[PDB]
Design a protein around this nucleic acid. Sequence first.
RNA 1: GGUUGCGGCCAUAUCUACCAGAAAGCACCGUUUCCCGUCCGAUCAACUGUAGUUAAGCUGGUAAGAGCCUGACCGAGUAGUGUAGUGGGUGACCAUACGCGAAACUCAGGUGCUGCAAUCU
RNA 2: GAGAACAGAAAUCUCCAGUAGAACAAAAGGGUAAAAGCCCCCUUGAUUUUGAUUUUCAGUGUGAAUACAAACCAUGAAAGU
RNA 3: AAGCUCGUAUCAGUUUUAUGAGGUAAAGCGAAUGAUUAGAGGUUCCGGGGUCGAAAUGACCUUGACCUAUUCUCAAACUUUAAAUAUGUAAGAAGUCCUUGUUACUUAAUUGAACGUGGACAUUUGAAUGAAGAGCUUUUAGUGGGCCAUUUUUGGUAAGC
Lengths: 145, 137, 159, 169, 296
Amino acid sequence: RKVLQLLRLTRINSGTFVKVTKATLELLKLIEPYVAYGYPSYSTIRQLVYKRGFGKINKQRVPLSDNAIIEANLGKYGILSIDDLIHEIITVGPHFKQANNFLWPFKLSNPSGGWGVPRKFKHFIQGGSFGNREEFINKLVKSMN
Amino acid sequence: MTTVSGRDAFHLRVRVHPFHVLRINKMQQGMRGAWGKPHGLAARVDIGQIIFSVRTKDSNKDVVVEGLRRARYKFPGQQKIILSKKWGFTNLDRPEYLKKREAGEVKDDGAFVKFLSKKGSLENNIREFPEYFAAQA
Amino acid sequence: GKSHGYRSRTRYMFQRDFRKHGAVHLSTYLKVYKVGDIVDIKANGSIQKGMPHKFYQGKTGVVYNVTKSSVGVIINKMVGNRYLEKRLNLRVEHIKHSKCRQEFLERVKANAAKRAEAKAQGVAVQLKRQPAQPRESRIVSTEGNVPQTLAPVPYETFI
Amino acid sequence: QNPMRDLKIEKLVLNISVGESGDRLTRASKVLEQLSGQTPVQSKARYTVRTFGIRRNEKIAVHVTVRGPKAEEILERGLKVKEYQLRDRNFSATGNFGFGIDEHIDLGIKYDPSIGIFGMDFYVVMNRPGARVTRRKRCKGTVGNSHKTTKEDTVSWFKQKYDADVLDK
Amino acid sequence: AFQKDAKSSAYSSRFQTPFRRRREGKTDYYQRKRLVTQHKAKYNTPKYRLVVRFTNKDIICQIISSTITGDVVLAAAYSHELPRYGITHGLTNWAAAYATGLLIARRTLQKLGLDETYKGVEEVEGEYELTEAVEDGPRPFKVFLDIGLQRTTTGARVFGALKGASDGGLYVPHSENRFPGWDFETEEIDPELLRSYIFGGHVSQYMEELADDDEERFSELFKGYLADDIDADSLEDIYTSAHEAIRADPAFKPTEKKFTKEQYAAESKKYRQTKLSKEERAARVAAKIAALAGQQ
RNA sequence: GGUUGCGGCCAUAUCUACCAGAAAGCACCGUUUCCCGUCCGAUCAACUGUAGUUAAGCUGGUAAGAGCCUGACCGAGUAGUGUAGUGGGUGACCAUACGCGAAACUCAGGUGCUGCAAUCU
RNA sequence: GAGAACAGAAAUCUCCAGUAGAACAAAAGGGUAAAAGCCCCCUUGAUUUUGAUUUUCAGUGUGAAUACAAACCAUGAAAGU
RNA sequence: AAGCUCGUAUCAGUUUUAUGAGGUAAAGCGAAUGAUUAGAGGUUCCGGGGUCGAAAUGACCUUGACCUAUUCUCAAACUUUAAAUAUGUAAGAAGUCCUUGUUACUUAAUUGAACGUGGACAUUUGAAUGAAGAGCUUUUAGUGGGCCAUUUUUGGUAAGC
Ligand SMILES: [Mg+2]
Ligand SMILES: [Mg+2]
Ligand SMILES: [Mg+2]
Ligand SMILES: [Mg+2]
Ligand SMILES: [Mg+2]
Ligand SMILES: [Mg+2]
Ligand SMILES: [Mg+2]
Ligand SMILES: [Mg+2]
Ligand SMILES: [Mg+2]
Ligand SMILES: [Mg+2]
Ligand SMILES: [Mg+2]
Ligand SMILES: [Mg+2]
Ligand SMILES: [Mg+2]
Ligand SMILES: [Mg+2]
Ligand SMILES: [Mg+2]
Ligand SMILES: [Mg+2]
Ligand SMILES: [Mg+2]
Ligand SMILES: [Mg+2]
Ligand SMILES: [Mg+2]
Ligand SMILES: [Mg+2]
Ligand SMILES: [Mg+2]
Ligand SMILES: [Mg+2]
Ligand SMILES: [Mg+2]
Ligand SMILES: [Mg+2]
Ligand SMILES: [Mg+2]
Ligand SMILES: [Mg+2]
Ligand SMILES: [Mg+2]
Ligand SMILES: [Mg+2]
Ligand SMILES: [Mg+2]
Ligand SMILES: [Mg+2]
Ligand SMILES: [Mg+2]
Ligand SMILES: [Mg+2]
Ligand SMILES: [Mg+2]
Ligand SMILES: [Mg+2]
Ligand SMILES: [Mg+2]
Ligand SMILES: [Mg+2]
Ligand SMILES: [Mg+2]
Ligand SMILES: [Mg+2]
Ligand SMILES: [Mg+2]
Ligand SMILES: [Mg+2]
Ligand SMILES: [Mg+2]
Ligand SMILES: [Mg+2]
Ligand SMILES: [Mg+2]
Ligand SMILES: [Mg+2]
Ligand SMILES: [Mg+2]
Ligand SMILES: [Mg+2]
Ligand SMILES: [Mg+2]
């Protein structure tokens, strides 16, 4: 619970990016039964950001949709386009914290193709859906984005 | 075991002691204060835990195994009989025990056995196990 | 019925450590405390006067007072949904200086160094701590070390 | 070797076990005093027995330890009574020895019907020099085996000076 | 030792060996604890002990303080330093004890500044007194008697040393009831007698009483007093001068040495067995089961 | 390097058996007038350092020694355990997934380190 | 364990081994070896003043306890207690 | 409920790093205590039997106890070792360094202890993640029969106990 909050996942099918270090790796470890996660590709970070990507701006949650919205709030850190944003995320840049926190938790729909699997709450490895499923995270996220 | 193969054919070892006391609420009062008096004893036993152990001449295998089979009926819950890799009640598989014995190393004792170690006083180690210290027969 | 006296439940807590009974070695007394020192608490069952209550066993606090044979330790004890301030009069045999800070202090002294060493050179510092990074690429060689292939083993019984 | 690992008498302790306290005991005391010169000590019963007729801390015995020349005089003097023949027992595993004699008159010492007759326990504890190591206050230590008194060495010692016999097997 | 005695695996395994310095019968920790520890609100203030120890005929005097790495000699005076001063015989005696104490007081008190101020009783009528704090000035050097294992008898010479360090100027808190000439059956010190021990009156009166009741013995012990023509009477002037000489220059003369450390090194190594190697030890086994086994 | 006095950590210092120790030091050791304590000058007190001894103490070395200390993919990723499932099984219980992970065992290595002052062929 | 007249399974004397296997009013558990146990010596600090603190807790009371301050004392050569 | 003082601020049913505490699970029992199966070898001027005997502190058998090195088995109120889960503190501006004032405390000592004056260094100022901010104050309702599930778990043969 707490962890799921600190990673800003407080409703089903919502998603965020996480930079991997020991100190977050353990956090992931703690919430495996309740999440599905993996290594996202350039392709799915781009389409995540282009379509479902919103900024937090004096709260509110503002669509990206114009580049001046980003330069306004992220420009301080270099970063003055939607692609600058994507670039910071994917390369885990020096300013990933600000760049990624700026991103409001993505809100996906349920997968179109379905889940694979007849039961979600076992681990991927056991025919289920949760845990690190590595590069197979893009197939899923795309079906939900 | 004895009637079929003789009272000195074999060695039976109950390998399990009933150290756990079973209580009983024998019986005006109802459930008020209901701490049993001792009723009987019982061994608490594991999975894979040996219950009986028996040693013979190989040429009696069946007779022993049929004995353990018949005793099975005397017990709750499935148990299964197993042929050992070990030499009798010893800790050693039949070859390793043979290698140690037909060396020097092993010496008789009441029912069991003693083994020369490379540790300790060279002196009173040469005392015991004289038939070592040649390294042949 | 129930019993809840002062050292209740403490059988092995206050108990003495295998082969370590007897006099307390003299350094326990040559050690020196000042206000603000952080100390860890552990009771020495051999010293009955001036002994912490079991709740404070294993606990760390800050010195607030120094007397002839004692130090006063403040501990925050949380009772309810709130902490309260507790002051503990302990004899020196139940207190030791805490290491809980030695990594900090060592790190400051050093952070001051790497900085001066940097500043008066041509900046570039980086002196916050960082978690275990995931490891990098690497090329493992085969030369001297071809892969050995294992498979799983059958069932056996040895007994 | 030997130079100074000689063989002295640590001390001689005489002991009179009486079944009781009172006159009979205090007389048995007098004996030891006029025989030791030194003023003797009294021992209390360690518990109760009732078939020995003795209550705890009753005073039940007296005794005295004598060291140096005085000890030899008395030793010999009872060794006389015992005609200079002891036994392969007597000599303890740790090297002391003792013997009893009844009738204390059998060694100098007149009679006096107001004193009575008592039997004594003679017990000779032997040691070599440097026994102090075990007995002193600081740096208390123990004497090494090639110094510790033994039965063999004390019987040997005995069989020599005095020129007495050991007897038995 | 004895077969049915001796020890088991069990016994030795569970054995808790004492502190070394107790196994050695040297350190009484119960009192060391109480000699050394400081008021916790007096922080790094050392608690200097005046350690007095009697060997088979050397008197040792150190002012020592404690440190969790080891203790610390401030100053040290051995009664074998008394030939520098006019004492050659009987340096294990009461008056030597006094002298050596006196030497220790003066010596440090010197190297501490309180050399000039704080002299203690220069006179010595052995009246009873500790050294009083001067009016507006440094409080004196305070130090506590480490008798060590000594028994406390009223007469002990362990207190002889105490007297000269406290007649020397040190503040060494003490009472009178263990000084020679303290009346058991009245809380009263005869000082005409304690003066006598300070100067060695009991020894000289012995020397006298042997000079006409046995010169077999008087020559045996008191040999050297002959050999240097010092008969009794002068024994006071001997020590009275010793005090002068000691006060007049206590600053400790080390020995002229001869032969370097490096030398005492090499020659002592000559008599020092060095350990063995397992390879070496393995060769003593194999060798043993060559012989002791293979049928001679 | 030895040794002493005062130590710190308190067995790699302890235990059992045996041998070796120069020099100095400790020691054992002589004495009983004196302070002092004893049934006993053994302990404890004092006096000598003279009359004697390395025997013991002490120090060190030996031992397929007892013990103790260390180490290791030795045993063992075993036992146990946090977490998951509309997993298996009549049950007792047991597998599996993401993690944490012993103890015994076995084998090897070791057997006091060291502070302050004095002293020493 | 081994030794000494009466003296025995058990009386009193001695030596050796002895990590506590004893004792410490009492229940049990902690603790303790030049002591915290045993013998002796001197004692009244089991006293005076009024606060803080820990346990139980409401952070009330009560019980019990802890470390100090200000007294007067005890003991010890003393540090101290 | 009413708010009040402030606000990037300080905040946390979370991780990480560093440093503590613990005696449960497991384990152990040829380690202490307590239990338990088997033999083997010892030891008696000495627990009792029996042959020789006038006896023997006599010898020989014998069963007991003990001792030695072994063997099978156990513990909520046993234990050397000793987890996992839980658990205390710490990760800086209320910080680190220099200079040298105050006192009746404290030191042999202007020695220390406490509190200071003067000076040196800014946000990679000192881990992660989050933070619809944080802190604070008053007053008052209802409630003070609880029941269930997984896991741990006591009593009971058991119970929808
Ligand atoms: Mg994140
Ligand atoms: Mg589709
Ligand atoms: Mg469809
Ligand atoms: Mg389709
Ligand atoms: Mg389905
Ligand atoms: Mg879609
Ligand atoms: Mg009814
Ligand atoms: Mg009923
Ligand atoms: Mg009942
Ligand atoms: Mg069955
Ligand atoms: Mg209860
Ligand atoms: Mg001890
Ligand atoms: Mg008390
Ligand atoms: Mg000799
Ligand atoms: Mg009688
Ligand atoms: Mg034994
Ligand atoms: Mg063994
Ligand atoms: Mg004392
Ligand atoms: Mg010599
Ligand atoms: Mg006399
Ligand atoms: Mg003498
Ligand atoms: Mg003496
Ligand atoms: Mg020798
Ligand atoms: Mg010595
Ligand atoms: Mg060994
Ligand atoms: Mg588990
Ligand atoms: Mg579920
Ligand atoms: Mg299930
Ligand atoms: Mg399993
Ligand atoms: Mg008790
Ligand atoms: Mg003591
Ligand atoms: Mg009262
Ligand atoms: Mg009330
Ligand atoms: Mg418990
Ligand atoms: Mg268990
Ligand atoms: Mg088990
Ligand atoms: Mg274990
Ligand atoms: Mg056991
Ligand atoms: Mg085994
Ligand atoms: Mg347990
Ligand atoms: Mg935590
Ligand atoms: Mg944030
Ligand atoms: Mg906000
Ligand atoms: Mg309310
Ligand atoms: Mg209410
Ligand atoms: Mg109410
Ligand atoms: Mg109601």
